[PDB]
Design a protein around this ligand. Sequence first.
Ligand SMILES: *[C@@H]1O[C@H](CO)[C@@H](O[C@@H]2O[C@H](CO)[C@@H](O[C@@H]3O[C@H](CO[C@H]4O[C@H](CO[C@H]5O[C@H](CO)[C@@H](O)[C@H](O)[C@@H]5O[C@H]5O[C@H](CO)[C@@H](O)[C@H](O)[C@@H]5O)[C@@H](O)[C@H](O[C@H]5O[C@H](CO)[C@@H](O)[C@H](O)[C@@H]5O[C@H]5O[C@H](CO)[C@@H](O)[C@H](O)[C@@H]5O)[C@@H]4O)[C@@H](O)[C@H](O[C@@H]4O[C@H](CO)[C@@H](O)[C@H](O)[C@@H]4O[C@H]4O[C@H](CO)[C@@H](O)[C@H](O)[C@@H]4O[C@H]4O[C@H](CO)[C@@H](O)[C@H](O)[C@@H]4O)[C@@H]3O)[C@H](O)[C@H]2NC(C)=O)[C@H](O)[C@H]1NC(C)=O
Ligand SMILES: *[C@@H]1O[C@H](CO)[C@@H](O[C@@H]2O[C@H](CO)[C@@H](O[C@H]3O[C@H](CO[C@H]4O[C@H](CO[C@H]5O[C@H](CO)[C@@H](O)[C@H](O)[C@@H]5O[C@H]5O[C@H](CO)[C@@H](O)[C@H](O)[C@@H]5O)[C@@H](O)[C@H](O)[C@@H]4O)[C@@H](O)[C@H](O[C@H]4O[C@H](CO)[C@@H](O)[C@H](O)[C@@H]4O[C@H]4O[C@H](CO)[C@@H](O)[C@H](O)[C@@H]4O)[C@@H]3O)[C@H](O)[C@H]2NC(C)=O)[C@H](O)[C@H]1NC(C)=O
Ligand SMILES: *[C@@H]1O[C@H](CO)[C@@H](O[C@@H]2O[C@H](CO)[C@@H](O[C@H]3O[C@H](CO)[C@@H](O)[C@H](O)[C@@H]3O)[C@H](O)[C@H]2NC(C)=O)[C@H](O)[C@H]1NC(C)=O
Ligand SMILES: *[C@@H]1O[C@H](CO)[C@@H](O[C@@H]2O[C@H](CO)[C@@H](O)[C@H](O)[C@H]2NC(C)=O)[C@H](O)[C@H]1NC(C)=O
Ligand SMILES: *[C@@H]1O[C@H](CO)[C@@H](O)[C@H](O)[C@H]1NC(C)=O
Ligand SMILES: *[C@@H]1O[C@H](CO)[C@@H](O)[C@H](O)[C@H]1NC(C)=O
Ligand SMILES: *[C@@H]1O[C@H](CO)[C@@H](O)[C@H](O)[C@H]1NC(C)=O
Ligand SMILES: *[C@@H]1O[C@H](CO)[C@@H](O)[C@H](O)[C@H]1NC(C)=O
Ligand SMILES: *[C@@H]1O[C@H](CO)[C@@H](O)[C@H](O)[C@H]1NC(C)=O
Ligand code: NA
Ligand code: NA
Length: 917
Amino acid sequence: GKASIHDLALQKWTVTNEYGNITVPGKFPSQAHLDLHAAGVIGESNNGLNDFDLRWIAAQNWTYTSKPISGLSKHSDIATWLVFDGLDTYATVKFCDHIVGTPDNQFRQWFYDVSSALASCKSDPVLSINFGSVPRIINAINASDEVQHWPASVVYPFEYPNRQWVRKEQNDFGWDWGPAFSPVGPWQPGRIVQLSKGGELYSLNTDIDIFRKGQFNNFAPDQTAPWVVNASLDFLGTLPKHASMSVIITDASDSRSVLYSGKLEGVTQSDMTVTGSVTIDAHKPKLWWPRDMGNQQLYNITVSVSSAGSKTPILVSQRRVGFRTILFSSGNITDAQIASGITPGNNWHFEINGHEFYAKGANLIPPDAFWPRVTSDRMNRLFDSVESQNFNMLRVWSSGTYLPDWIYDIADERGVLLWSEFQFSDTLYPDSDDFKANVVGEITYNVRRLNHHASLACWMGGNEFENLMLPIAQGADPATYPYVLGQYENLFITTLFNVLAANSHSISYSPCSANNGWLEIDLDLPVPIVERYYNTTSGHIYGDTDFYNYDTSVSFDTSAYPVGRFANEFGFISMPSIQTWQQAVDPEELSFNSTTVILRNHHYPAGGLTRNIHNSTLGQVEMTLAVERYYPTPDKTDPVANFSSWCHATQLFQADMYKSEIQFYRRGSGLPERQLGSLYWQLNDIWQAPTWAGLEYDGRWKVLPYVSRRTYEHVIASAFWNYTANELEIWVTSDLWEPVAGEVSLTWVDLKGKPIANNAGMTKSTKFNVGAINTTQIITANIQSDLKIPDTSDAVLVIELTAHGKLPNAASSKTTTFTHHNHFLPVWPNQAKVSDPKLHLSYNKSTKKFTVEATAGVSLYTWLTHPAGVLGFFDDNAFVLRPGEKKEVGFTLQQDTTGGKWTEQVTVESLWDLTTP
Ligand SMILES: *[C@@H]1O[C@H](CO)[C@@H](O[C@@H]2O[C@H](CO)[C@@H](O[C@@H]3O[C@H](CO[C@H]4O[C@H](CO[C@H]5O[C@H](CO)[C@@H](O)[C@H](O)[C@@H]5O[C@H]5O[C@H](CO)[C@@H](O)[C@H](O)[C@@H]5O)[C@@H](O)[C@H](O[C@H]5O[C@H](CO)[C@@H](O)[C@H](O)[C@@H]5O[C@H]5O[C@H](CO)[C@@H](O)[C@H](O)[C@@H]5O)[C@@H]4O)[C@@H](O)[C@H](O[C@@H]4O[C@H](CO)[C@@H](O)[C@H](O)[C@@H]4O[C@H]4O[C@H](CO)[C@@H](O)[C@H](O)[C@@H]4O[C@H]4O[C@H](CO)[C@@H](O)[C@H](O)[C@@H]4O)[C@@H]3O)[C@H](O)[C@H]2NC(C)=O)[C@H](O)[C@H]1NC(C)=O
Ligand SMILES: *[C@@H]1O[C@H](CO)[C@@H](O[C@@H]2O[C@H](CO)[C@@H](O[C@H]3O[C@H](CO[C@H]4O[C@H](CO[C@H]5O[C@H](CO)[C@@H](O)[C@H](O)[C@@H]5O[C@H]5O[C@H](CO)[C@@H](O)[C@H](O)[C@@H]5O)[C@@H](O)[C@H](O)[C@@H]4O)[C@@H](O)[C@H](O[C@H]4O[C@H](CO)[C@@H](O)[C@H](O)[C@@H]4O[C@H]4O[C@H](CO)[C@@H](O)[C@H](O)[C@@H]4O)[C@@H]3O)[C@H](O)[C@H]2NC(C)=O)[C@H](O)[C@H]1NC(C)=O
Ligand SMILES: *[C@@H]1O[C@H](CO)[C@@H](O[C@@H]2O[C@H](CO)[C@@H](O[C@H]3O[C@H](CO)[C@@H](O)[C@H](O)[C@@H]3O)[C@H](O)[C@H]2NC(C)=O)[C@H](O)[C@H]1NC(C)=O
Ligand SMILES: *[C@@H]1O[C@H](CO)[C@@H](O[C@@H]2O[C@H](CO)[C@@H](O)[C@H](O)[C@H]2NC(C)=O)[C@H](O)[C@H]1NC(C)=O
Ligand SMILES: *[C@@H]1O[C@H](CO)[C@@H](O)[C@H](O)[C@H]1NC(C)=O
Ligand SMILES: *[C@@H]1O[C@H](CO)[C@@H](O)[C@H](O)[C@H]1NC(C)=O
Ligand SMILES: *[C@@H]1O[C@H](CO)[C@@H](O)[C@H](O)[C@H]1NC(C)=O
Ligand SMILES: *[C@@H]1O[C@H](CO)[C@@H](O)[C@H](O)[C@H]1NC(C)=O
Ligand SMILES: *[C@@H]1O[C@H](CO)[C@@H](O)[C@H](O)[C@H]1NC(C)=O
Ligand code: NA
Ligand code: NA
């Protein structure tokens, strides 16, 4: 009595428009834009001015129609189910010309019993799904006087308005880094399931919750307590009474190694769910740790459900899990912490297996406007870049969508923690019973689906509420504010925290991405999480920092930087490379201020459907002023080269700025705020455009990820310049869990490479001692009073740190050697009297290393550019080169279309090359 499964991917599909004039072959999973493009009806969607040009697609319905489905049993003894892991978004599901469902959530798994429609069918059944025009449907919802309305500033759009009414990826209606395609279709896998009476069941969703005995969300668990493995299985259809549950927990690496094999206790069952648990000895399982914190130990758990009077199990579910505790700490700073020197207020940090760690990473946004075309290769390449940059965490930004299982699998294997969020962003949402019920379905499904993942670090209700949107609402409408605040608590706390707490004991919660923490957490309270909000005391520090300041005059002034617990967002836009631009924009539009380049810059957004040149120009100006203030301004005779050099110059500013911020946040770990995290805005691009991204759409590295890789190293030497006071401070910051000792080399040379007399009055070398997740000031000097630099515009301090220590949880007796390369320029980069360094580049086919040598003098911001046709990244880039120093640079080759020829096409340049004709 096995379950008969037909994958909908293996069925023949046809896509039709609303007006019956367009008919193209379809795919499953897919979206209309992709099927239209594959057929040649439209060009690539990311190209030119297609954000405007392709609006006729989103403005209409698209229907996915299968050819008649063969192989289904017509025996009335058999329940036939349509199972959809994702439909985007408003759809009408027809089976044999009968409407059986009307889904309205992208983030929910939909299942419909089609047994009667099948029985009624005169011939083989046709499955059709008619996807509505989301902007039309939302406009119609808003048009009703009977629904809720908010002030203009609260529901202000990026491109399409009324997005708060739909349970669809919010950036699909446009964002300030992306287009507004509003795609529709079967965005995730789908199946037809035929179940026989008294036979095998079908697994819909499985929730595995591995926690320490007595563990509760947002509270530090007991690390000496035994492990509890709770298995809750959602299914179709009929499970008989007195159900039995057994598990086999084997090592994910070796099947032969069995952790636990036995029955589950405290079995509970309902119409479509069966739950049980097992307690395992605290000493037995090997712990999972994030990357560079130990091993990423995983286990394969297979849960078998048997019925009384059945030899074989009727339901079997498998998941890959990890034994670990992850705490998001947002409660009050304890008396013990105050006594240790920590400023009072509230926490904002993470703890892995009871250990505090410094979080390093960025914000992950969707890599494509069309989720179906995002492949395993594309995500694995992105993850290579994440690891190479020395990340331990990504913030999975809302909204955004809930990532599929396969993406979390990558993070589980690699050891990258994923700070996760519910799909609510930069606006206020309705709180009607129907909307809330739809949200509950989405939260229940995704929390249950994702709980087993070792990489899941936390759940946050939404993006930018208490720090932005709620204060906007209080200003925009003081009278309606308490009501609106009440809805926020009702949806994001009362409902959402309860749905999470019911389905997870292991994952911590925060009602939004940025807040001042909580006063109380108690499920007995009408509002379970009592938020601190603006109940603050002067001098006290609360929450994470979400900081952007576009005034370029203070970009490198640390007194302008926020003093907080954690930095979850920070950034400035930069142009992508010319190679990236060439993929989407016409050659004649390859100029800094071309109409197509401007219109693709969504900083600042249109605030509607207009071609807003004014708002977009604001971002273009910000980039221009940033270059003009600090970097050599290109003036190349070749317009192509001029555009490329200006693009590069914007990247230099972005990189250096983030570095200035990262080193400041990291140094805070040893200061009274006890800063424990840096997540820059943003990691990746959704398309070819000027954004806050470090990784371009195809994966190409900007200057930013090379500078952030170094700045995210375990032990770093950071130069802090108070330019108004003319004071230089060099600090050593370590994120290791043990103290380390080491030395920092300090070499003052002129721009020709010749040493400055008496090393400009500064010591040539200094020893250091830095504590666990702490900082130490190694140098303090006034550039005028304490130092003797003959010409500040003909001087550079080269910083080289060496330290010896151990990474957390290293078995090895052998100590790791930590090295960090940095520099200090006593003037802005545009003031440095650089001369042609006369760079020589060569590639060695055996060692797979590029040799870079500066021949005539000092080279600043030495830059290697890989051509198009190759994917990957260099082992270092944007570095200082002293003459005669032969630098070896390797390349992580991810993909090559050149047959090895790409190495001949690699170019080298420096700060000097910006100002040549
Ligand atoms: C393992 O794991 C698991 C999980 O997984 C777990 O379990 C869990 O538990 C928890 C705790 O308890 C819970 O929670 C709860 O809930 C409730 C509701 O319930 C209902 O529902 C649910 C859900 O459903 C869904 O889902 C599922 C899954 O999937 C399925 O199955 C179904 O079918 C459904 O589905 C659907 O829907 C969805 C959405 O939602 C979607 O998605 C889908 O698709 C579809 O459509 C369920 O589950 C339940 O079921 C249940 O129950 C029944 C009877 O009723 C049975 O039959 C079954 O079996 C179950 O049972 C279970 O549970 C219970 C409890 O409930 C117990 O007893 C038993 O034994 C068993 O176990 C149902 O149906 C809600 O309501 C609640 O509430 C709350 O509570 C809290 C605490 O707890 C608090 O805080 C809050 O507040 C609330 O309360 C309130 O209210 C009440 C009334 O209503 C009262 O009484 C109280 O007092 C309060 O009030 C008060 O206060 C306030 C303030 O605060 C004021 O205002 C007033 O005035 C007054 O004064 C809760 O949340 C859950 O449920 C569970 N789950 C399960 C699945 O099971 C376990 O535990 C673990 N284990 C270990 C060892 O750890
Ligand atoms: C483009 O695509 C869209 C989306 O796929 C198409 O619209 C969809 O059309 C289908 C078929 O017409 C609708 O299916 C249902 O239709 C009626 C209900 O009609 C009533 O409700 C709808 C929806 O109202 C909601 O949306 C509008 C915005 O458009 C909004 O103004 C309104 O306030 C409502 O919004 C609330 O609710 C939704 C959730 O539904 C939330 O998302 C919102 O947030 C908000 O809370 C109105 O448009 C109508 O004017 C009318 O008021 C219903 O009777 C149908 O019932 C059949 O199907 C169910 C199974 O689903 C079954 O149980 C029933 O027994 C019944 O089945 C029998 O009848 C059918 C024939 O009808 C037969 O084949 C069967 O064999 C059975 O004998 C059905 O549920 C769907 O609601 C609608 N979706 C939306 C979002 O509008 C649109 O047609 C298409 N256009 C073109 C040109 O192709
Ligand atoms: C691309 O787009 C802009 C086209 O209008 C252009 O912006 C202009 O940039 C100049 C500087 O190059 C600004 O000039 C002033 O900028 C500040 C602002 O107060 C002053 O401190 C300066 O001394 C200078 O007077 C203009 O204000 C600015 N125009 C606007 C409308 O803001 C960009 O320069 C163009 N970019 C490139 C690379 O060509
Ligand atoms: C390279 O690009 C820069 C920046 O766009 C060009 O500089 C502009 O030149 C025009 C000449 O009419 C001036 O009116 C603008 O004020 C200049 N803008 C800036 C930001 O300096 C430069 O002309 C280009 N070089 C070429 C093609 O020779
Ligand atoms: C399809 O028909 C509509 C009118 O029913 C028209 O506006 C649209 O341009 C037509 N499209 C094509 C590709 O023929
Ligand atoms: C939403 O509805 C109100 C009232 O019907 C209307 O004034 C407003 O223009 C609508 N908003 C949009 C963006 O369509
Ligand atoms: C463990 O399960 C994963 C899927 O979650 C699978 O890819 C892997 O092959 C399994 N390994 C073993 C040893 O069972
Ligand atoms: C964007 O454009 C709208 C419409 O012209 C305008 O009201 C808004 O202020 C602009 N945004 C910014 C940041 O200037
Ligand atoms: C950092 O190190 C200093 C000594 O340099 C020490 O007094 C302080 O308590 C340390 N802070 C932490 C959080 O370890
Ligand atoms: Na105080
Ligand atoms: Na944001």
